[model samples]
Target: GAMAQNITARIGEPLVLKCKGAPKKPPQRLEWKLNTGRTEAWKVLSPQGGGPWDSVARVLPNGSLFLPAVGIQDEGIFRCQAMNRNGKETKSNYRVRVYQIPGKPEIVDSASELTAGVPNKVGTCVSEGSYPAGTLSWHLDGKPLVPNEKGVSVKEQTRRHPETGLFTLQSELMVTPARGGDPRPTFSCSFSPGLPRHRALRTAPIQPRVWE
Candidate 1:
């Protein structure tokens, strides 16, 4: 084993973990393992050996493990060991983290209302059908719905999808109409994939504003 190399990848994208350690003999045999340091253990993926029965990963001719469509479960510490008839062996480690460029979030109901002075339930911003959980925020007519702010409250929740092991984020916005001027304020939801991919995405209504 050696110092683990940290790697990052995106969900639904391609991923390849290459083997290391050069000192070898002829007609070598290589072995690969998932050093998750936890469960999903005792599994091997290699051409020289045999791939796990349920692994969607394949070993390339160059001894690189390739995944066509990477998902959350594919993230872990990967290790590879090479051996030869001379009994020479070397090992390398890789730590990989996977994230998703969250699909553009959408309002549960494209149009919701805000009464002139009373509190109103605008809409719930939902970011489902995507991979890895992401950050969610609410904004209205160029105003971010920060907590402790007057006249508005934003609540957020997230859950891991059972089948995909991805995440679904939902945010509910409760706001009072900006009063008189603009009946239906532009409501929006923004998301972030966090570090390594410090980009942001937001969604606003195309045809919204069904105010009372």
Candidate 2:
């Protein structure tokens, strides 16, 4: 039997867990429960038993649990307890996680004018709807922006949505666009790499007009 298992799911995806080493003859004793980690305590799963469990998830008579559409709320530890008529018990545990990637990052609120010697607030890069949080970093001409340089700075923030456990990553880029350097230093914000392929999306390169 699988003593423990770890699972990662994307939003609105299907999640399935099969009870291992459970007797098929006496199926009545097989039960599944979720350790919600709240004061509400353990929740018994249905066709066996949460509110209207069938809408989001359910346990089948075959001692398997299925979630038609998994959400962050579905993240938790689940236990499958199978007891035999002879007084023997078998247990399987599963730890579930949920993650989702946001769409392409966007550079918003761009400044209309930029000066050559002073730090100028260019634009804010935003990546929303990621799970487990993600980071946004500034890049210049396809390379990482060096914050140590004079008049070059970046302000980053992350916050989770109250209703949906998704995270929104934001960063503001400030730089002194010099006349001699990359005449038009293209700036882009990239989401941290993780999960599926092409998970990290880069903001459209933006080059503000630098005035003397």
Candidate 3:
């Protein structure tokens, strides 16, 4: 009952949870249990004959657990218990964490033109197919664009896929052009920092006309 092993997994990747403490004797038996969440009860993954079969997961003859493709629901704590003929028992535990990195964000319905001194809707920025719900931010000429009530404004939201538990991020931006600033300012959207193993990724910049 020491500290459980930690493993970070990604969506659609293969994974294996090793049972390092399982008994390897001739008359030994092994079983696996999953604790999905605190509200739910422990689920038996492996019976004597490995019942409750699943396509993506299985218990190997050597007592290791294998996953062909990891899913968001696969994130949990797994327990491996083994018993030998002499009534000796051994156990191992692992905690799994899952994450996903989305592709480049996209800008749709971009404004062809904007009016100076008035906030204009630029476009909708969307980043889909990510886990844990990434955040979206606006950029102007590759620099961070902070929103202002009278000059710039941004609305953001995150939606999740019911079946996969993946997230889709969206941000709508509005900007008011200064009379003497860059006539064709470029705008884009990017995933904010703090995502695991990935730098920020952004959409291609969009330039629009500014009229007085």
Candidate 4:
């Protein structure tokens, strides 16, 4: 009888296969094989006298075969055979798939242009068409700007891609008026977890505006 099913797995991931049944008596021998032409014998994970039925294949308490860190070369059919004192035997087989992450994200500035001395003015930094979502932060003069009443405002936005199962992230920062007699402040937006981190910076000139 077919006591187990074929196995499959993806590269760089763990694989879990299972085999279970109720035998009249303890089996004398348990064995596993790969359908491939390779003659290398299967490595039994369970040691003798450790438990009943000679469990194998990195067996877990739940009877699942755990293959930690599966690779592309691991793709193939697996068989688990169990035999009892009565010479009765059963076997079962499973399939695997692996995929890669999507491309890098596209970044854009939500606020392109702003007045030099605008109070409480806001600018947004957005990463468009990203995978696995990214992070955002604000920097001033090569250092992270702490959030405060007069400092820039920061916000984040993210959404998942239905087709690719990836994420998109966006961040925004609103700047306040710089201190009197201060030169233009350089503000920047940065993104992470992708190639070529996206960054944008702008400096404000020293100019005082008087409201009418």
Candidate 5:
């Protein structure tokens, strides 16, 4: 009952919630429900319930819950309760979050190329189709970026997609050049899911910057 674990899931994906650590003996009574201050009192569960079969979601014989296809509405807190014949009860809790995987990234710039010895605000990296938001970090030569002599500045913005209930990101890196700057610079964009349980490789196309 203290700091329940959180679950992050993707839409149209299957998710399993484990309820472990049962008493040495089996409880005579057990139940599962979506907890909402114990007032609303509802939801479709498996192993015999007052709901449809397909709509029942799925409760494993061992009491674990299975979600065949996760959706936004499926996100929330869940509780599993077990009680012995002696009227003693124990419960396990979990929270759920559902998101859509983001697509590859693209690059747009204010100017077609960068100019040497100039305060250059260039390289606008963007990821248009994402779910639950995604983060983008700049990379140089396939490595983490460090602002050096080339006055590099970065800013991030969240753009809401009106057509879809997804997220879009815009990360800009402005390079105020040194007296003599990089004649040619290669760049890459990395989209990261912060502490994600599921791992995926999503790629974006980046156009290299040319110097003038």
Candidate 6:
């Protein structure tokens, strides 16, 4: 028989495990046991016992168990067994772990206005407190912006959350003063995967003043 290792599941999520082994003959009986205080066994077979087991839990043709949804109490060791009339039996083991996602990101810093007529310098935008870390980017007039000596400088930051096992991303941007008679450009900082694609435009742009 094959035994499964301990499994960990979130409070409100699904969990799954698989059991497999060779049988002397076609398995006549297959059962799953949970390591709760009481020694109870759940038979995973159809009512006929001759046909397949039909229930919320299912046994795959290849001899595996599939749990559609799992709860916190479902965490524990599991056992899988196959048997035939000859009394031949086989079994295997598996493990599961679950974790939570991190909280939303907080805007750490807002871009400051730049003085006009000065050489273009890099500006930074920061967001902290993001769970499962997020990506940061810059935008100009509703369009994605990239860093360049002539345009703006964007920096990429990656942060990891040990508690939630997630990552966060930060970005920075540098800009030069708009050329004389050119329309002042708008800049913004944005989070990725949190909002819709190209949804960055919703953020207000920072307008720098020129000292001509």
Candidate 2 lDDT tens digits, 73-125: 77788888886667788788998877787878899998867888778898899
lDDT of 4 by residue, 1-212 (tens): 23344333433566676543414333325544553322254533441324422332355544445667654345556665665456777665643333323243333443434454564444555554443354666666577766655555677788776664445666666666544623445566565643233333233311223222
Clashes of each: 0, 2, 0, 15, 1, 21
Candidate 3 local Cα displacement, residue 19, angstroms: 1.5
Per-residue lDDT tens digits for candidate 5, residues 43-83, read: 53544544453453566666677778776667678777776
Question: Estimated TM-score per prediction?
Answer: 0.72, 0.77, 0.78, 0.39, 0.69, 0.44
Which regions in candidate 2 have their CA more than 4 angstroms from the true location? 1-3, 23-28, 37-39, 83-90, 146-150, 157-165, 193-198, 209-212
lDDT of candidate model 5 versus the reference = 0.66
Candidate 6: tens digits of C-alpha lDDT, residues 1-212: 34446455543454555555434333446666555322254333321334322333455554555556553334445667766455677675544444333334333455444654554543555554443244677776777776665555666777765654355666666666655733456666666644223232134467655444
lDDT values for all models: 0.69, 0.77, 0.80, 0.49, 0.66, 0.51
Q: Please report, as a residue range, the 10-residue window in candidate 5 with the lowest summed lDDT.
A: 19-28
lDDT score, candidate 2: 0.77
Q: Ranking under lDDT, best-scoring first?
A: 3, 2, 1, 5, 6, 4
**Candidate 1 global Cα RMSD:** 4.2
Q: Where's the lowest-lDDT run of ten residues in candidate 4?
A: 203-212
| Per-residue error (Å), model 1, residue 92 | 3.0
What C-alpha lDDT, on a 0 to 100 scale, does residue 198 get in candidate 5?
50
